[PDB]
Structure 1
């Protein structure tokens, strides 16, 4: 009887950070309450100043990472303020029935809804908006995020021993399809209805104009670089709601990787690069062994370094010359 269960209210945080949680469940099953407010907003996505009309959960691209345990109930209050112009909904890949919730959560501007589902399968999962007839337009406008459903006894390695992270980040990767004119310059639009046919035409090229982490070129760099210390265990959750990606930590590895995100399966070990299919979340566990700057990319390097799918880690600590050293520094002889 769900009314006899504890309720716990979660207050979400902006990606790539993740709201506080316990790896190992410290209670029995709970109804875990979340609220998200849909926000249609202009976003500048590149260094050139290209501005799109983003469709967001909670103001961000991606939407925030939600975290529960297996056989908790997720109860989401989804708000679509009357400041928005479009109908929206939500499909959880973690959920069972009604198109993952999309059939039950259609909210016009000025409406709200509350959906509850049981998180019966452990893993990281995509969630995304999916309004009938307009699904890829919403998703590729940034209206997607992820949910992690931890096993109640936390993560385990390929032999059944615990894997405990010290830090977790969520990297949402977004393919955008900004319409172009015949000369190649990005077009802009005065209403969503006036944009729609050209959005469809741009999507049908299957060629993104931009592929970004955390909503913009360079978002996870500089003052917003990811951080870690030597010897810290870091879980990077990575989602792509629409298109394949191939994550890679430049200078590191995925020590344990669930490339298709589902924790009942043993992880793949020692990965250089892995394939997260479009429509999937994956998760990589790494223990840092060297300080300095790392890049974290989609290893189609064009997608990374020309189209935006690249972020950085700044790692503190001592350098290990046993693991790597310059024997003879670059010089002319």
Structure 2
């Protein structure tokens, strides 16, 4: 019975960071309290100025990652401010009953609600908005994120040996469906409601205009690249609420991967490319061994390089000639 448990309050952080948390814990179960505020807004999603009439949890695509442990209760206050036009709700894949909580969290602008559910299964789980009759539109417009439910004793390998990460990053991948007018240029809409019909027509083609990490082409590149150093283990959380994707670290590997994202199952090792089913979150560990700029991308290379599904990780440290060496630099072919 959850009425008599300790309560705790978590402050969420913006992706690609994940809020402070423990992996293995000596703690017993708690009610962990979170709040999220819905924001509708127009967003620039590419380098040429294209806009999306977007919908977000907490002002970001994806929403923030929520972290608890197996046996905890998640208690979320979902706030829909009066500045928004549309009703919203939340469907937690990590939860049992009531369409993931969607039936109990229907909030119109100016309303809020509080849902509690038991996080009784370990793994990374999508959450997303799911208003009746509008579900795909809200999802593709940006309303998704990850709940990570860690085992109380932390992550385990297939033999039950301990695994860990030293830093965690959360990547949401969004297939977008931006309409075009008769001149072949992307449409710019003055309100969210006026983008709907044209967008639905593009959706039904099943061909995204853009496929982006974290809300924009280039979101995780340049000054916003992810960072690590040789000898550090990174956890890459990858959510796709609507459409399959195939993550790959160029120059690296998935050392241990839960591609279905559920930690009571053994992970696979040594992956070049893994698969995240649309409507799921998966999780990869990798310990860096070489310094340099890596690319983390969807390995449909059209979706990555043409449509936007690619980011960078900048890694500090010492080069290792045992793992890789340039034996002869590029040079003229011998006479």
> TM-score normalized by structure 1?
0.98
Q: Which ranges in structure 1 are unaligned for 5 or more consecutive residues?
A: none
Deviation track 1:98-156 (CA, whole Å, cap 9, x = no partner) reads 00001110100000000000001100000000101000000000110011000110000
Cα deviation, residue 183, structure 1: 4.3
Cα deviation, residue 239, structure 1: 0.3
Cα deviation, residue 3, structure 1: 2.4
Deviation track 1:19-68 (CA, whole Å, cap 9, x = no partner) reads 00100123100000000000001111000011111100000000000000
Whether contact under 8 Å (2:53, 2:191) holds in the other structure is: no
* Partner in structure 2 of residue 96 of structure 1: 96
Shifted more, 31-40 versus 176-185: the winner is 176-185
* Partner in structure 2 of residue 204 of structure 1: 204
* Partner in structure 2 of residue 240 of structure 1: 240
Cα deviation, residue 184, structure 1: 2.8
* Partner in structure 1 of residue 46 of structure 2: 46
* Mapped partners of 2:155, 2:116: distance in 1: 25
* Partner in structure 1 of residue 331 of structure 2: 331
Alignment RMSD = 0.9
Shifted more, 9-18 versus 179-188: the winner is 179-188
* Mapped partners of 2:3, 2:122: distance in 1: 23
* Partner in structure 2 of residue 27 of structure 1: 27
- Answering whether residue 320 of structure 2 is matched by residue 309 of structure 1, we say no
* Mapped partners of 1:281, 1:242: distance in 2: 11
Cα deviation, residue 195, structure 1: 2.2
**1:236 alignment partner, SS class:** strand
Deviation track 1:186-216 (CA, whole Å, cap 9, x = no partner) reads 1122333332211110100100111111110
Count the aligned residue pairs.
333
**2:200 alignment partner, SS class:** helix
Whether contact under 8 Å (2:54, 2:192) holds in the other structure is: no
* Mapped partners of 1:154, 1:184: distance in 2: 51
* Partner in structure 2 of residue 64 of structure 1: 64
Cα deviation, residue 180, structure 1: 1.6
* Mapped partners of 2:182, 2:207: distance in 1: 15
**1:155 alignment partner, SS class:** coil
- Answering whether residue 25 of structure 2 is matched by residue 9 of structure 1, we say no
Whether contact under 8 Å (2:91, 2:101) holds in the other structure is: yes
* Partner in structure 2 of residue 134 of structure 1: 134
* Partner in structure 2 of residue 111 of structure 1: 111
> TM-score normalized by structure 2?
0.98
Deviation track 1:215-264 (CA, whole Å, cap 9, x = no partner) reads 10101011110011101111100000000000000000001000010001
- Answering whether residue 278 of structure 2 is matched by residue 285 of structure 1, we say no
* Mapped partners of 2:193, 2:156: distance in 1: 48
Cα deviation, residue 7, structure 1: 0.5
* Partner in structure 2 of residue 18 of structure 1: 18
* Partner in structure 1 of residue 257 of structure 2: 257
* Partner in structure 2 of residue 120 of structure 1: 120
